[PDB]
Structures are given as C-alpha cells and as structure tokens.
C-alpha cells in the first residue's frame, strides 16, 4: 500500500541522469542535485536518462509512478486534479487521471493497479543508440504541485523501476518532482535556503 522509495542499482547498475538545463526564469524544466528535485512546467518535456553498467535481457521494461513524499499522505493515490482529468488533453495512449505520461513512444502502457489502484506508466527498455552512452525517456507532468484537490501543493516523488517481462525489480531510483510557473527561480530559491 506504500511502494518502496529505496534507492538500488542492481546488477545491471541502474541510475538515472539530468540534463544540465540552469536555471533561467525561462528554463521548463531543470534539475537540482542537490535537492534531488526535478522542477519543470506543467505539461513539459523532461528528459529523463537511463544509465547502465550493462545491458539488461530482452523484455525489460522501465515503470515511472509517483507518490507524496510525505508520510502523512503516502498512501493516497497521486492522481490529477479535478479540473485537468476533465479538460479533454488525452494523448489517446494517456487515461486523462494519470499524472505522469510518456511522450513520443507507441508502446507506452498505462497501468491502474487492481489491488492498490496507483497509477503508472511502462515501457520497453531499449538500450543506448550509437553513439550514445545511456537511454533517454521524455515524461510530462500533467497537473501543478498546487492543483487543487488535486496534489494540492503537497510534494510527490517520482519512482523509477528497472523491471524484468514479469514486473520483477532490476532496479529503483527516484525524484522529487515540482510543477510550477518558474522552474528556474524555484530551484534557484530553494537551493538559496538550503545553504542557509
Ligand atoms: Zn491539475
């Protein structure tokens, strides 16, 4: 009824990547490490990277799902808002409750769990193109933190799951996500009062 958070690369050596996108008033989506913390835009590519040590068999699959971070509301279902469920944006692939799509891939599936109802979004692993060093998947994130009745301005983190054909655990990693007008001055503020 709470999925686990826990960081683990398994043996294939999962860990996910960011750009380096700085953090520009006009920026829509950046990073910040040292939050561990994705800030983007409602409803705009973030490029997510998959890294390996080696590559994992044929079949694998890559799950994104997103909880609330905090533990007062973990076990509530993070699902978009009362107004955006309703405001006809569905890609055709997207049921219009699932916060987190994936952009640009036909066989992304959308999952609601029988038993805990969360939601999430799957799809094939395909290893690194020539010339390239890892795997990139661009997820949107289809409601602000502050959406009402929706996540209501409470922090969610994104988890993601490295995942044989039969849904068993390669691997996890895992994200704070912020949706807002200003991902650049939002990272910039809260990595101000960090430090402080
Ligand atoms: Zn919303």
Known sequence: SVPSQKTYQGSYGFRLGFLHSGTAKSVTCTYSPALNKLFCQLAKTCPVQLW?????????????????????????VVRRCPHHERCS????????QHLIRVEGN??????????????????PYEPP????????????????????????????????????SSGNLLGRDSFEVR?????????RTEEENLRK
Do not use: W
Request: hydrophobic content about 30%; overall charge negative.
């Open 179 to 187: 949706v807002c007008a200003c991902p650049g001055r939002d990272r």
């Open 52 to 76: 390996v040590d080696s590559t994992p068999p044929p079949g694998t699959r890559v799950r994104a799902m997103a909880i609330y971070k905090q533990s007062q509301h973990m076990t509530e």
């Open 129 to 164: 193109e020539v010339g390239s060093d890892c795997t990139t998947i661009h997820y949107n994130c289809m409601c602000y933190s502050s959406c009402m009745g929706g996540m209501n301005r409470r922090p969610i983190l994104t988890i993601i799951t490295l995942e044989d």
């Open 89 to 96: 944006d569905s890609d055709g692939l997207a049921p219009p």
């Open 106 to 123: 036909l066989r992304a599936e959308y999952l609601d769990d029988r038993n805990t109802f969360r939601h999430s979004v799957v799809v």
